[PDB]
Design an enzyme around this catalytic site. Structure first.
Site, PDB file in Angstrom:
ATOM      1  N   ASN A  17      25.717  14.485  18.067  1.00  0.00           N
ATOM      2  CA  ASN A  17      25.009  15.364  18.984  1.00  0.00           C
ATOM      3  C   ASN A  17      25.307  15.106  20.447  1.00  0.00           C
ATOM      4  OD1 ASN A  17      22.240  16.021  20.568  1.00  0.00           O
ATOM      5  ND2 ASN A  17      22.490  17.468  18.857  1.00  0.00           N
ATOM      6  N   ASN A  43      22.788  23.978  18.552  1.00  0.00           N
ATOM      7  CA  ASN A  43      21.358  23.859  18.317  1.00  0.00           C
ATOM      8  C   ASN A  43      20.527  24.630  19.342  1.00  0.00           C
ATOM      9  OD1 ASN A  43      21.718  21.914  16.087  1.00  0.00           O
ATOM     10  ND2 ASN A  43      22.369  20.581  17.754  1.00  0.00           N
ATOM     11  N   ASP A 100      18.058  23.598  20.995  1.00  0.00           N
ATOM     12  CA  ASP A 100      17.649  22.803  22.146  1.00  0.00           C
ATOM     13  C   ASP A 100      18.721  22.752  23.228  1.00  0.00           C
ATOM     14  OD1 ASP A 100      19.473  21.016  21.044  1.00  0.00           O
ATOM     15  OD2 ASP A 100      18.050  19.372  20.922  1.00  0.00           O
ATOM     16  N   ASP A 109      26.286  19.753  17.845  1.00  0.00           N
ATOM     17  CA  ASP A 109      26.720  18.658  16.941  1.00  0.00           C
ATOM     18  C   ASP A 109      28.221  18.850  16.741  1.00  0.00           C
ATOM     19  OD1 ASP A 109      24.014  17.780  16.611  1.00  0.00           O
ATOM     20  OD2 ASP A 109      23.767  19.209  15.010  1.00  0.00           O
ATOM     21  N   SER A 118      21.859  21.589  22.757  1.00  0.00           N
ATOM     22  CA  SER A 118      22.867  20.605  22.356  1.00  0.00           C
ATOM     23  C   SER A 118      23.765  21.205  21.267  1.00  0.00           C
ATOM     24  CB  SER A 118      22.212  19.338  21.848  1.00  0.00           C
ATOM     25  OG  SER A 118      21.595  19.532  20.581  1.00  0.00           O
ATOM     26  N   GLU A 132      27.586  24.305   7.223  1.00  0.00           N
ATOM     27  CA  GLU A 132      28.139  25.621   6.937  1.00  0.00           C
ATOM     28  C   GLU A 132      29.013  25.583   5.682  1.00  0.00           C
ATOM     29  OE1 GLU A 132      27.371  28.658   8.253  1.00  0.00           O
ATOM     30  OE2 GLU A 132      27.621  28.653  10.435  1.00  0.00           O
TER      31      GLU A 132
END
Length: 129
Positions: free
Chosen positions: A59, A46, A48, A52, A50, A35
């Site tokens: 992660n 994310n 999925d 970070d 998860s 960012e």
């Protein structure tokens, strides 16, 4: 804490990341950028499920315990929120473990998706190191 690019490269080098497990310093600086910033408190969610965490974008699926996902393996043995510290030491230590335990930097999602295949050394050019 926010770092500038060369400031962060210098700190990562001081913490032993340059050439660690075969990976020149720019790999690590590259995977930290998120960012439009280098911020110890950043989180990247994310698709999925998860997230970070922190300056080294660690992660939550395997490496830290996010406190919400049941059965978290937590291989770095740390709460994910603890990777948002102003001192980068915990994050460095966990990232070193990702690459060492995970048998290469493909184990680091941020790098795999955002840095692999690029001229990573550009991230450390122009800096005092």
């Amino acid at each position: 804490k926010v770092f500038g690019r060369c400031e962060l490269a210098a700190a990562m080098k001081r913490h032993g990341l340059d050439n660690y497990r075969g990976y020149s310093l720019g790999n690590w600086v590259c995977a930290a950028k998120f960012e439009s910033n280098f911020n110890t408190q950043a989180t990247n969610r994310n698709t999925d499920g998860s997230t970070d965490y922190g300056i080294l974008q660690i992660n939550s699926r395997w490496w830290c315990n996010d406190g919400r996902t049941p059965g978290s393996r937590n291989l770095c043995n740390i709460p994910c929120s603890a990777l948002l510290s102003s001192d980068i030491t915990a994050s460095v230590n966990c990232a070193k473990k990702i690459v060492s335990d995970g048998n290469g930097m493909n184990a680091w999602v941020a790098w795999r998706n955002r840095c692999k295949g690029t001229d990573v050394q550009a991230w450390i050019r122009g800096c005092r190191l």
